[PDB]
Enzyme design. Structure first.
Site, PDB file in Angstrom:
ATOM      1  N   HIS A  14     -12.197 -32.814-112.190  1.00 46.69           N
ATOM      2  CA  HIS A  14     -13.015 -32.261-113.304  1.00 46.69           C
ATOM      3  C   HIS A  14     -14.157 -33.223-113.665  1.00 46.69           C
ATOM      4  O   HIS A  14     -15.313 -32.731-113.832  1.00 46.69           O
ATOM      5  CB  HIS A  14     -12.103 -31.952-114.482  1.00 46.69           C
ATOM      6  CG  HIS A  14     -11.140 -30.858-114.188  1.00 46.69           C
ATOM      7  ND1 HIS A  14     -11.555 -29.629-113.654  1.00 46.69           N
ATOM      8  CD2 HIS A  14      -9.802 -30.789-114.383  1.00 46.69           C
ATOM      9  CE1 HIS A  14     -10.499 -28.862-113.513  1.00 46.69           C
ATOM     10  NE2 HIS A  14      -9.403 -29.549-113.964  1.00 46.69           N
ATOM     11  N   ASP A 109     -16.346 -27.620-118.503  1.00 44.55           N
ATOM     12  CA  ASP A 109     -15.829 -27.049-117.242  1.00 44.55           C
ATOM     13  C   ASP A 109     -14.962 -25.862-117.653  1.00 44.55           C
ATOM     14  O   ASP A 109     -14.935 -25.551-118.854  1.00 44.55           O
ATOM     15  CB  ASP A 109     -15.162 -28.141-116.396  1.00 44.55           C
ATOM     16  CG  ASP A 109     -13.960 -28.818-117.034  1.00 44.55           C
ATOM     17  OD1 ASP A 109     -13.124 -28.101-117.639  1.00 44.55           O
ATOM     18  OD2 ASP A 109     -13.869 -30.069-116.921  1.00 44.55           O
TER      19      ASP A 109
HETATM   20  O1  LIG Z   1     -11.123 -40.407 -98.719  1.00 47.55           O
HETATM   21  C1  LIG Z   1     -11.848 -39.779 -99.489  1.00 47.55           C
HETATM   22  C2  LIG Z   1     -11.465 -38.630-100.258  1.00 47.55           C
HETATM   23  C3  LIG Z   1     -12.363 -38.042-101.062  1.00 47.55           C
HETATM   24  N1  LIG Z   1     -13.654 -38.498-101.185  1.00 47.55           N
HETATM   25  C4  LIG Z   1     -14.625 -37.834-102.077  1.00 47.55           C
HETATM   26  O2  LIG Z   1     -13.938 -37.336-103.205  1.00 47.55           O
HETATM   27  C5  LIG Z   1     -14.396 -35.992-103.517  1.00 47.55           C
HETATM   28  C6  LIG Z   1     -13.268 -35.011-103.307  1.00 47.55           C
HETATM   29  O3  LIG Z   1     -13.738 -33.672-103.602  1.00 47.55           O
HETATM   30  P1  LIG Z   1     -12.753 -32.435-103.331  1.00 47.55           P
HETATM   31  O4  LIG Z   1     -13.428 -31.167-103.739  1.00 47.55           O
HETATM   32  O5  LIG Z   1     -12.207 -32.531-101.945  1.00 47.55           O
HETATM   33  O6  LIG Z   1     -11.575 -32.748-104.373  1.00 47.55           O
HETATM   34  P2  LIG Z   1     -11.398 -32.442-105.937  1.00 47.55           P
HETATM   35  O7  LIG Z   1     -12.676 -32.755-106.643  1.00 47.55           O
HETATM   36  O8  LIG Z   1     -10.153 -33.104-106.427  1.00 47.55           O
HETATM   37  O9  LIG Z   1     -11.180 -30.853-105.929  1.00 47.55           O
HETATM   38  C7  LIG Z   1     -10.696 -30.157-107.047  1.00 47.55           C
HETATM   39  O10 LIG Z   1     -11.770 -29.722-107.861  1.00 47.55           O
HETATM   40  C8  LIG Z   1     -12.674 -28.834-107.178  1.00 47.55           C
HETATM   41  C9  LIG Z   1     -13.807 -28.539-108.134  1.00 47.55           C
HETATM   42  O11 LIG Z   1     -13.314 -28.150-109.415  1.00 47.55           O
HETATM   43  C10 LIG Z   1     -11.918 -27.582-106.747  1.00 47.55           C
HETATM   44  O12 LIG Z   1     -12.811 -26.714-106.055  1.00 47.55           O
HETATM   45  C11 LIG Z   1     -10.751 -27.960-105.843  1.00 47.55           C
HETATM   46  O13 LIG Z   1      -9.966 -26.807-105.549  1.00 47.55           O
HETATM   47  C12 LIG Z   1      -9.882 -28.981-106.551  1.00 47.55           C
HETATM   48  F1  LIG Z   1      -8.914 -29.451-105.645  1.00 47.55           F
HETATM   49  C13 LIG Z   1     -15.641 -35.784-102.644  1.00 47.55           C
HETATM   50  O14 LIG Z   1     -16.817 -36.227-103.310  1.00 47.55           O
HETATM   51  C14 LIG Z   1     -15.318 -36.641-101.418  1.00 47.55           C
HETATM   52  O15 LIG Z   1     -16.473 -37.084-100.737  1.00 47.55           O
HETATM   53  C15 LIG Z   1     -14.099 -39.599-100.477  1.00 47.55           C
HETATM   54  O16 LIG Z   1     -15.242 -40.029-100.566  1.00 47.55           O
HETATM   55  N2  LIG Z   1     -13.159 -40.180 -99.663  1.00 47.55           N
HETATM   56  C1  LIG Z   2      -6.856 -22.075-111.294  1.00 44.33           C
HETATM   57  O1  LIG Z   2      -8.147 -22.039-110.703  1.00 44.33           O
HETATM   58  C2  LIG Z   2      -8.844 -23.216-110.602  1.00 44.33           C
HETATM   59  C3  LIG Z   2      -8.228 -24.457-110.755  1.00 44.33           C
HETATM   60  C4  LIG Z   2      -8.978 -25.630-110.669  1.00 44.33           C
HETATM   61  C5  LIG Z   2      -8.307 -26.927-110.836  1.00 44.33           C
HETATM   62  C6  LIG Z   2      -8.629 -28.064-110.238  1.00 44.33           C
HETATM   63  C7  LIG Z   2      -8.016 -29.388-110.425  1.00 44.33           C
HETATM   64  C8  LIG Z   2      -8.776 -30.527-110.147  1.00 44.33           C
HETATM   65  C9  LIG Z   2      -8.262 -31.803-110.294  1.00 44.33           C
HETATM   66  C10 LIG Z   2      -6.961 -31.979-110.740  1.00 44.33           C
HETATM   67  O2  LIG Z   2      -6.503 -33.258-110.891  1.00 44.33           O
HETATM   68  C11 LIG Z   2      -6.181 -30.859-111.024  1.00 44.33           C
HETATM   69  C12 LIG Z   2      -6.702 -29.585-110.867  1.00 44.33           C
HETATM   70  C13 LIG Z   2     -10.351 -25.548-110.425  1.00 44.33           C
HETATM   71  C14 LIG Z   2     -10.949 -24.300-110.283  1.00 44.33           C
HETATM   72  O3  LIG Z   2     -12.284 -24.144-110.031  1.00 44.33           O
HETATM   73  C15 LIG Z   2     -13.206 -25.003-110.694  1.00 44.33           C
HETATM   74  C16 LIG Z   2     -10.207 -23.130-110.359  1.00 44.33           C
END
Ligand SMILES: O=c1ccn([C@@H]2O[C@H](COP(=O)(O)OP(=O)(O)O[C@H]3O[C@H](CO)[C@@H](O)[C@H](O)[C@H]3F)[C@@H](O)[C@H]2O)c(=O)[nH]1
Ligand SMILES: COc1cc(/C=C/c2ccc(O)cc2)cc(OC)c1
Length: 440
Positions: A14, A109
């Site tokens: 987030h 968000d």
């Molecule tokens: O070894 C590593 C591992 C990661 N990174 C970096 O960390 C970031 C990971 O983004 P990613 O979308 O894969 O994970 P995250 O933000 O937790 O996703 C959630 O949040 C998203 C947005 O809300 C959602 O779409 C998704 O479903 C959720 F899981 C991204 O900028 C990578 O380049 C890195 O540099 N090296």
């Molecule tokens: C349930 O649908 C969604 C969950 C989430 C949750 C993501 C999330 C990211 C980091 C965490 O540590 C836990 C959940 C994001 C979404 O789009 C922005 C949609």
């Protein structure tokens, strides 16, 4: 300089996307940003590093920790309750910012919708920054209707949902919180979605070329729905600390390396890691694998030694944007989080999708069946992806025809992405167009 207040939900997935939106607002426009961060625990080393590393034009303020006895579960429930029990603190901080500065907009968000009414009362326009796909937003606007229409658990609906402009989506691929309608997670997700209507606007980290069906639908199907502004892709520059990775990649042939990385949040069993190891080793392909414990003593006997010719194992972390933008890197085996996917789209790297949690299963279907820029292994009944199947899908991507077709399509999206984020791109223009209303 006008002030924009951003209230991220707690958690790095987030925080990071919203920090990056913040860095775009202060880089492109004459604004300052104050981050108000609700917290369940005192600042982390990870949080403090990231936040102290921002331009001086981005101030930050950790809010009083929410007393953990005020909690009665999924991240959706934790996050929602953090926002609720931080409402007094945020109002107090906003009230004081509003008297000492011109606050022109509040940005949250998808879990910060409690603040929207509050911001309106104080004459501050509230905006949603949606950090996932237009398809995912459209699914959520439709979920209340779908809740009344379908009475079974969504995985027992044999018919797929077919949202206007979108790939068919089976119930087993619906967002994590919607896979148990008896859990509080489902009720909280519905409560937030019913408030999306209160936003002055919804930014989406996507672009028209990538999701034209879903964007057309969001912007036309309903006047109830607020303005929707595709302003993506916004991804980190990735220019920082760490790592033998780039040295290793400089020694590999063009497009020959499969990058293998799940999130920090993506947790595989020792069993599934060992199947993935044997699977990479028998594929015959080169690979860079970010290995997180279920330093490599748990991996199959002899494997580390047998793959020194052709694979590199990184503990914990790797410079993702630097890996994906390297000329050696020909494919990406990912969990389909949207920031990881967008990084891969703007560098034209085709995928093997292995979704794990949140809205990843939906992202996987979109990328595999919709855009056809991803392949997908079949799990055996028990949920495990077998070594043989990993090897098949790796070879299909790195040397096979389906790989060529996916890579071609992913390069086409790559050129769209560069275009829409250039000086006169649709995404650059549209953000500038909304932000100008704030400057005055
Ligand atoms: O070894 C590593 C591992 C990661 N990174 C970096 O960390 C970031 C990971 O983004 P990613 O979308 O894969 O994970 P995250 O933000 O937790 O996703 C959630 O949040 C998203 C947005 O809300 C959602 O779409 C998704 O479903 C959720 F899981 C991204 O900028 C990578 O380049 C890195 O540099 N090296
Ligand atoms: C349930 O649908 C969604 C969950 C989430 C949750 C993501 C999330 C990211 C980091 C965490 O540590 C836990 C959940 C994001 C979404 O789009 C922005 C949609």
């Amino acid at each position: 300089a006008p002030l924009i207040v951003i209230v991220p939900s707690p958690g790095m997935g987030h925080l990071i996307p919203l920090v990056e939106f913040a860095k775009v607002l202060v880089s492109r426009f004459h604004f300052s940003v104050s981050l108000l961060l609700p917290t369940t625990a005192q600042p982390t080393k990870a949080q403090t590093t990231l936040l102290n590393s921002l331009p001086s034009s981005v101030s930050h303020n950790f809010l009083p920790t929410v007393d953990p006895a005020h909690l009665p579960v999924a991240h959706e429930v934790t996050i929602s309750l953090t926002h609720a029990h931080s409402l007094s603190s945020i109002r107090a901080a906003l009230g004081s910012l509003a008297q000492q500065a011109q606050v022109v907009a509040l940005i949250t968000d998808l879990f910060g919708t409690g603040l929207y009414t509050v911001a309106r009362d104080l004459g501050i326009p509230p905006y949603l920054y949606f950090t996932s796909t237009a398809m995912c937003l459209l699914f959520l606007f439709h979920l209340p209707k779908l809740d009344e229409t379908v009475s079974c658990e969504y995985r027992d609906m044999p018919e797929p949902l077919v949202l206007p402009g979108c790939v068919p989506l089976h119930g087993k691929d619906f967002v994590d919180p919607a896979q148990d309608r008896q859990d509080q997670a489902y009720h909280v997700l519905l409560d937030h979605v019913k408030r999306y209507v209160l936003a002055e606007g919804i930014f989406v980290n996507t672009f028209v070329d990538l999701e034209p069906g879903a964007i057309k639908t969001l912007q036309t199907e309903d006047p109830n729905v607020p303005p929707v502004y595709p302003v993506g892709p916004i991804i980190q520059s990735g220019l920082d600390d760490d790592s033998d990775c780039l040295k290793w990649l400089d020694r590999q042939p063009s497009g020959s390396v499969l990058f293998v990385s799940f999130g920090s949040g993506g947790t595989l069993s020792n069993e599934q890691l060992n199947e993935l190891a044997i699977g990479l080793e028998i594929s015959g392909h080169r690979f860079l694998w970010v290995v997180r414990s279920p330093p490599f003593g748990f991996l199959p006997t002899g494997f580390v030694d047998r793959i020194k010719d052709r694979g590199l194992l990184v503990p914990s972390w790797a410079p993702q944007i630097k890996v994906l933008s390297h000329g050696s890197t020909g494919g990406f085996l990912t969990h389909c989080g949207w920031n990881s996917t967008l990084e891969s789209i703007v560098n034209g790297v085709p995928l093997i999708v292995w979704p794990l949690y949140a809205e990843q299963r939906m992202n996987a279907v979109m990328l595999n069946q919709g855009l056809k820029v991803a392949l997908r292994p079949n799990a055996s009944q028990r949920g495990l992806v077998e070594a043989d199947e990993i090897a098949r899908v790796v070879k299909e991507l790195m040397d096979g025809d389906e790989g060529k077709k996916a890579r071609y399509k992913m390069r086409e999206l790559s050129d769209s992405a560069k275009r829409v984020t250039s000086e006169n791109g649709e995404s650059t223009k549209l953000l500038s167009e909304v932000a100008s209303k704030w400057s005055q």
